[PDB]
Design an enzyme around this catalytic site. Sequence first.
Site, short mmCIF file in Angstrom:
data_model
loop_
_atom_site.label_atom_id
_atom_site.label_comp_id
_atom_site.label_asym_id
_atom_site.label_seq_id
_atom_site.Cartn_x
_atom_site.Cartn_y
_atom_site.Cartn_z
N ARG C 14 79.65 -75.93 63.37
CA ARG C 14 80.12 -74.58 63.25
C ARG C 14 79.79 -73.93 61.87
NH1 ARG C 14 86.13 -75.23 64.66
NH2 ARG C 14 86.22 -73.07 63.87
N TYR C 383 54.46 -62.97 25.71
CA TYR C 383 53.64 -63.64 26.74
C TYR C 383 52.31 -62.89 27.00
CZ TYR C 383 52.40 -64.97 31.64
OH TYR C 383 51.68 -65.30 32.81
C1 R83 Z 1 51.64 -62.05 23.22
O1 R83 Z 1 51.44 -61.19 24.40
C2 R83 Z 1 50.52 -60.15 24.21
C3 R83 Z 1 49.57 -60.17 23.18
C4 R83 Z 1 48.69 -59.14 23.08
O2 R83 Z 1 47.79 -59.04 22.03
C5 R83 Z 1 47.71 -60.26 21.17
C6 R83 Z 1 48.77 -58.06 23.99
S1 R83 Z 1 47.64 -56.74 23.89
O3 R83 Z 1 47.86 -55.99 25.09
O4 R83 Z 1 47.65 -56.16 22.63
N1 R83 Z 1 46.06 -57.37 24.03
C7 R83 Z 1 45.66 -58.26 25.14
C8 R83 Z 1 45.35 -59.64 24.58
C9 R83 Z 1 45.78 -60.74 25.34
C10 R83 Z 1 45.53 -62.02 24.84
C11 R83 Z 1 44.85 -62.21 23.63
C12 R83 Z 1 44.37 -61.12 22.89
C13 R83 Z 1 44.62 -59.83 23.37
N2 R83 Z 1 44.14 -58.72 22.65
C14 R83 Z 1 43.79 -58.93 21.24
C15 R83 Z 1 43.45 -57.55 20.57
C16 R83 Z 1 42.49 -56.69 21.41
C17 R83 Z 1 42.72 -56.79 22.94
C18 R83 Z 1 42.92 -58.27 23.32
C19 R83 Z 1 49.66 -58.08 25.06
C20 R83 Z 1 50.51 -59.14 25.19
N3 R83 Z 1 51.50 -59.26 26.18
C21 R83 Z 1 52.20 -58.24 26.79
C22 R83 Z 1 53.27 -58.65 27.81
O5 R83 Z 1 51.84 -57.06 26.57
#
Ligand code: R83
Lengths: 456, 456, 456
Positions: C14, C383
């Site tokens: 049940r 992240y």
């Molecule tokens: C730590 O999480 C992030 C790190 C970032 O830059 C280091 C960025 S970002 O958007 O500035 N750049 C994307 C990214 C991801 C991984 C490694 C490097 C990068 N950026 C370095 C600078 C130029 C674009 C790539 C975004 C996130 N996460 C969130 C939830 O927004």
Amino acid sequence: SNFAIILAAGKGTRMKSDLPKVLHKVAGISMLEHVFRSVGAIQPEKTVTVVGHKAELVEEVLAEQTEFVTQSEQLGTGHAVMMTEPILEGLSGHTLVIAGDTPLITGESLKNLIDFHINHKNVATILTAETDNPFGYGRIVRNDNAEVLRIVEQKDATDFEKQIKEINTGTYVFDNERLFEALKNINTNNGEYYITDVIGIFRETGEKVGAYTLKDFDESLGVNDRVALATAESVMRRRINHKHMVNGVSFVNPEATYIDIDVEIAPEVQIEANVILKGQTKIGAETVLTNGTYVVDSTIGAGAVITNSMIEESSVADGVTVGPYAHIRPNSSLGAQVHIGNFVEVKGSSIGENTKAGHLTYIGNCEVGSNVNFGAGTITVNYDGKNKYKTVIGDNVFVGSNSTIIAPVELGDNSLVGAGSTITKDVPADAIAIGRGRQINKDEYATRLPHHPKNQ
Amino acid sequence: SNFAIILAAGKGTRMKSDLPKVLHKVAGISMLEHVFRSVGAIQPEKTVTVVGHKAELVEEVLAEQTEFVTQSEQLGTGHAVMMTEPILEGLSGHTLVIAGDTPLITGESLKNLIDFHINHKNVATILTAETDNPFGYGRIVRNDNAEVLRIVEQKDATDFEKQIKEINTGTYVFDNERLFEALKNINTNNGEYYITDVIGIFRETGEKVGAYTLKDFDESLGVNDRVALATAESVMRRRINHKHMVNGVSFVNPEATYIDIDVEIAPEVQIEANVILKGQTKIGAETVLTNGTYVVDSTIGAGAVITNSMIEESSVADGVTVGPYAHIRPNSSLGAQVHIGNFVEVKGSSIGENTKAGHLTYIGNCEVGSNVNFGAGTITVNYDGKNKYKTVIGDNVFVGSNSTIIAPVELGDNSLVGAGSTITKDVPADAIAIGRGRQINKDEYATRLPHHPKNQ
Amino acid sequence: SNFAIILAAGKGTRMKSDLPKVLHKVAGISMLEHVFRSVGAIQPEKTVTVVGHKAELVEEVLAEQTEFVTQSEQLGTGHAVMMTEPILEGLSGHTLVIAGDTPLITGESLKNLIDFHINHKNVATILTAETDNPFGYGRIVRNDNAEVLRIVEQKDATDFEKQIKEINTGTYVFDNERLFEALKNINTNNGEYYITDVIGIFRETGEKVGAYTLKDFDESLGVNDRVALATAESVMRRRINHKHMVNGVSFVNPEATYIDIDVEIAPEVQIEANVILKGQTKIGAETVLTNGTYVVDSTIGAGAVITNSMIEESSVADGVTVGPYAHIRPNSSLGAQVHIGNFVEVKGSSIGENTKAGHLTYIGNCEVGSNVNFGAGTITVNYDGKNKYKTVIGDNVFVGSNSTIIAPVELGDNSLVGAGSTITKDVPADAIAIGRGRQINKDEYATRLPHHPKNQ
Ligand SMILES: COc1cc(OC)c(S(=O)(=O)NCc2ccccc2N2CCCCC2)cc1NC(C)=O
Ligand SMILES: COc1cc(OC)c(S(=O)(=O)NCc2ccccc2N2CCCCC2)cc1NC(C)=O
Ligand SMILES: COc1cc(OC)c(S(=O)(=O)NCc2ccccc2N2CCCCC2)cc1NC(C)=O
């Protein structure tokens, strides 16, 4: 003439509290104030409250409403009442004695008690009640014509007496002159002494003692611990919400809706379960309050819809919609038809008619005109670590989403703030203001980043 | 053949309402519809509803379900029933007369009433009930073989009659032909007239009048004010949630859980106290609904977890997690395993499988692919003051935290939006887009600012 | 010596569940664990639990607390008990037999049962109870000296026997040696067999069978479906919250407040209705918990105020204020006097004394010093799609409103982040950091935009 003596001297050991026992709240005010309100129905010519434990806290609560006298230590109800003798001695009339811890007793019951007394020319009337479980209470022993012969405490009770269902609630009306004559007799004849002793004196002198029985046993509740305080809360809740429903207010669940004793609610209001209305709150006609909504000391107009939101010390005009999950903080005013949506906080701000802030927005210390629009994520900024600044926003301003408005700044009528902008200076009427970095794309580059499916 | 006459003509003065009294809702539908549902158990060949006050509102509610007749003014239950005579006159059968304001009466009770009637070949059967507090109700006077002799109203009651516990609920089954013959007699003999008068006619003619007694007194509830409306709500709630629990649904507190009459809930659902499910909502197997959750006209799949969140006119697939404090607004679809976290609003958007938006985010008027990620604080922007634009977001898009996405813009598959960016134009698949000002530090300067500890 | 045999072999058809029936939870733990706790009051020298359906799930719950034996299929209570015979056979003592599905029976009742048994030198004592609606239950037939003669099941009951109010709860104390001797007799004489059969054997041999009657019928509840599971929940709730109120805790509504069996609450805590405290939670003195608040496995200090907020697996020091509508997620620590306001989420972060985050903020994976300030709308970013980074924020940091802080980055003591900034690199102590586009106004231009009043 009627007089009243309210007992409020006791601590309340079982409460586990340092409050005077009568100051614990039921439906928004102390037990003591509930008792004071009921006492008022007898139209007493003099009201004297006996204080003891933390007298000053009680004297603040009833300041200017009663005379006070103090009992310096706990020597019983008889001594408590004796403290009132320099005020009441020798006056002609009927004197209610009632404890500050019986907050469910109604003014209608007190008036029926006084009338019963006067009408039967009793020298003492005990307010009694009847219960199937009398263990613990003084039993009322009546003779065959139904006069009280005595009050027998549990301990001194014969087995036949324990079957008695009619109990002493500890509330009484006495002939005032006889009351103080008898208490002096008891006093001079000795270390606690008891107001019940006066009943035995009147039994020695063959003076007429009566009993008036409460129709509802729950009214006799004497609150000695937090279990009993929650019972009083439950009886009071049902009492308040029944008044509301009779007055034309709908309750999904009036046993689980929490409205304070002095809240005002117009007819045709609809209230879901689990709504909380506290203090000097007023709710206008046809307004709807949904589950979770919490209002304290606020006025809400007619035809509003308050969806699961908390509003404090503020005014809300007609037709306003707030929520779900919004927070209107002290000293806010929401003008007619305003809309405040989810995860929005309004603090210390006046918001003009028809303005909308539907999402993820903080409006702090702003004067806001009519027909203004705030995009989702708009943040006003008023505090630098020391100064609290004001922002002035004119009529028909369009604040772009996720903008940051740094006070003190003025947005003139009809101006617009570009979405994502940080605004550090005034924007003239009819102007736009854009303060953000321009978007640059790079093709292919996501391919080396961790979110890319191929790296996944 | 069985026929039914439902009385729905009355205003309801004590409701303090302009609604017809029978239109007030219990568990999501009017009292009248509850009564209509129970009536259906008798399989009536004809159902006639008598309307009066704001007839058009009632006629909308039961449109295409019943015949209507109108009584132009209030001249009593006998006149009400007389309005049905041009439809029912002379037909052979058993006619239930029941008021639209007794919404707890069950179809099982109506069928036992009809069967009792037919089986004892009564000319009239009164549905009665028994209460310890009969004050106010017509008492049922039976002779020694237990036939009804009469119905005595409170006012005309002898003291012996007031002790009678068996009361008239105001619901009846009559032989249909005899019913209209007797009412014409009463009518031609005169300004209100009463359906109870027919009982007295049958007592003059020695025709057989019986009484069938409800097992549960609460079923006889006639709702005349909002106090009684909340009682009906409470009995109905317990009724609905008991059906659920028997069906395999767990309730932390089924006396304080608010589920509408037509909500569907699969076995093994677990529901905490203070959850609200309204309208055409369906909850799939093993789904968990936590305290505060509020769903209206939505479908929720299997194995979902809805944590203190409000969902409206939307579909939620299997395994979705929403909340705490999220808001899924009309016309949203959350695909399998989606996650929507705290302070997130979804409006008018389709969100593909496994996508996540955990925080402080507004997704408005978007078509969103699978395995998308929205950083905390992401704002979509769809409304300019006139136009409402759409945004298209492909699969495996990574939207950086605190970005502002200004529709109409397309984010192609696997693209990324840099955290803090204002996005004003399309981003191709596999591209990144960065739209923000670059950080410049100035050493030592905090020292002259108000937050500095030394200025503190 | 006392021994205990707990029956936990049954499925529960049940329930519509695949759980073993005894594993369904009441107030946070299984029915079985409630029964185990009560059993402990008898100080049993051996406790044996009989398992059957999904034995492994039950064996995890009581791992290291009991011996187990298995019954391979359902052949009745007599066979269940027979599985314990290789362990209990021939031992001298008193053996309680109790089912895992009677979770309201108290240890005080079990001890009074055992004492009654021993004191009257019964060979068997049935724990009985008394109800006005005995339909369904085995009736207890006593002779004139009040010894049990037999237990008569509903089906085999004569009409006079159906009037019997005293019922068999299915819980017993047996002389242990006689118990196994009688069961072998029954066993060898034959396919279900019943522990009630042993009563009839003792009636053949004229050995003394007694009955000890529960004072409270609700304790005898055997839970066979989710209706009964919610009753047990309601009785348990009232039981727990009464313990709290006696201990000095205030409840606005202890019938609608949901606190698990092992939650600890210091005196003078004030709890509004509809608060949920789950698992290993502790609440320090004078703390206030407002309606909607939900705490799981967390410690909350003294003098805190938790306003309609959800806190999980975290520690909250003295004087902290959280809410309304905030979310403290696992592994957070809020230092003394911290303030967390509306729409703020704290996850995996340590937050130092006096720090404030009043609005629309996400603090994820941060180590935060003392006297830090977060403006409304501040987003920490931890992240990237793969990595989870940490952010270090020193003492007296001022984080400007609507800033985006991208981990891993360090903000040094006393630094400031400009409102609206995207922070991509460390900020030294005493420095400022500004990362935002500068505001450019264009006069008159709003005039061609859709929000302008003239275009309206
Ligand atoms: C730590 O999480 C992030 C790190 C970032 O830059 C280091 C960025 S970002 O958007 O500035 N750049 C994307 C990214 C991801 C991984 C490694 C490097 C990068 N950026 C370095 C600078 C130029 C674009 C790539 C975004 C996130 N996460 C969130 C939830 O927004
Ligand atoms: C779609 O809604 C918006 C569009 C916008 O730009 C196209 C902007 S904006 O703030 O960037 N610019 C205002 C605007 C409105 C209508 C048409 C064009 C524009 N802008 C174009 C670029 C320069 C400023 C005018 C704001 C909103 N809406 C919200 C709620 O913020
Ligand atoms: C009114 O509150 C603020 C004012 C600000 O600039 C005037 C800034 S700021 O971050 O832009 N600059 C810090 C600051 C504080 C006090 C006085 C001046 C300033 N800035 C002036 C412009 C350059 C940096 C110093 C931040 C706040 N408050 C919040 C909660 O963010």
